[PDB]
Design a protein around this motif. Sequence first.
Motif, mmCIF file in Angstrom:
data_model
loop_
_atom_site.group_PDB
_atom_site.id
_atom_site.type_symbol
_atom_site.label_atom_id
_atom_site.label_comp_id
_atom_site.label_asym_id
_atom_site.label_seq_id
_atom_site.Cartn_x
_atom_site.Cartn_y
_atom_site.Cartn_z
ATOM 1 N N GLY A 1 -0.414 -3.261 -3.979
ATOM 2 C CA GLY A 1 -1.394 -4.242 -3.447
ATOM 3 C C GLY A 1 -2.679 -3.477 -3.258
ATOM 4 O O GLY A 1 -2.623 -2.260 -3.089
ATOM 5 N N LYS A 2 -3.817 -4.152 -3.347
ATOM 6 C CA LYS A 2 -5.116 -3.502 -3.189
ATOM 7 C C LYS A 2 -5.871 -3.950 -1.931
ATOM 8 O O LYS A 2 -6.881 -3.344 -1.574
ATOM 9 N N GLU A 3 -5.383 -5.000 -1.266
ATOM 10 C CA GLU A 3 -6.016 -5.511 -0.052
ATOM 11 C C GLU A 3 -5.848 -4.559 1.137
ATOM 12 O O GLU A 3 -4.916 -3.765 1.194
ATOM 13 N N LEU A 4 -6.783 -4.636 2.075
ATOM 14 C CA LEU A 4 -6.773 -3.770 3.240
ATOM 15 C C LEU A 4 -6.520 -4.517 4.531
ATOM 16 O O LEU A 4 -6.892 -5.689 4.658
ATOM 17 N N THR A 28 -3.510 -0.084 3.310
ATOM 18 C CA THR A 28 -3.479 -0.907 2.120
ATOM 19 C C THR A 28 -2.226 -1.792 2.184
ATOM 20 O O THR A 28 -1.100 -1.293 2.273
ATOM 21 N N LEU A 30 0.553 -3.681 0.860
ATOM 22 C CA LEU A 30 1.293 -3.689 -0.386
ATOM 23 C C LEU A 30 2.058 -4.984 -0.640
ATOM 24 O O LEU A 30 2.145 -5.437 -1.778
ATOM 25 N N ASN A 31 2.587 -5.591 0.413
ATOM 26 C CA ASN A 31 3.375 -6.798 0.243
ATOM 27 C C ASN A 31 3.427 -7.537 1.562
ATOM 28 O O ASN A 31 3.912 -7.009 2.564
ATOM 29 N N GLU A 41 0.541 0.898 3.114
ATOM 30 C CA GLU A 41 0.430 2.307 2.789
ATOM 31 C C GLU A 41 -0.503 2.910 3.843
ATOM 32 O O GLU A 41 -1.621 2.418 4.040
ATOM 33 N N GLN A 46 4.365 5.270 3.097
ATOM 34 C CA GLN A 46 4.630 3.850 2.800
ATOM 35 C C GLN A 46 5.828 3.248 3.570
ATOM 36 O O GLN A 46 6.832 3.933 3.816
ATOM 37 N N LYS A 56 -5.657 -8.637 8.283
ATOM 38 C CA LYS A 56 -6.258 -8.602 6.952
ATOM 39 C C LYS A 56 -7.779 -8.482 7.089
ATOM 40 O O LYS A 56 -8.373 -9.111 7.962
ATOM 41 N N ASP A 58 -9.961 -9.385 4.804
ATOM 42 C CA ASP A 58 -10.614 -10.470 4.093
ATOM 43 C C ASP A 58 -10.134 -11.765 4.734
ATOM 44 O O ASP A 58 -8.900 -11.942 4.842
#
Length: 58
Positions: A1-4, A28, A30-31, A41, A46, A56, A58
């Motif tokens: 996943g790329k979201e933070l 980060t 991941l899921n 992460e 992890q 989140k 965003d």
Amino acid sequence: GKELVLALYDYQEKSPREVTMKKGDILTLLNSTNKDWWKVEVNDRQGYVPAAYVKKLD
């Protein structure tokens, strides 16, 4: 996943599948398929943390 996500609290891993984070950490996501535990992460580590303990970006 790329979201933070921003860690809202400190959290020490309670099981082999969990990961440790400090409040203020930017992780980060991941899921986030599970309602209660999101896999993230933490730098080079992890595992899962309680979904409610992260936010989140965003």
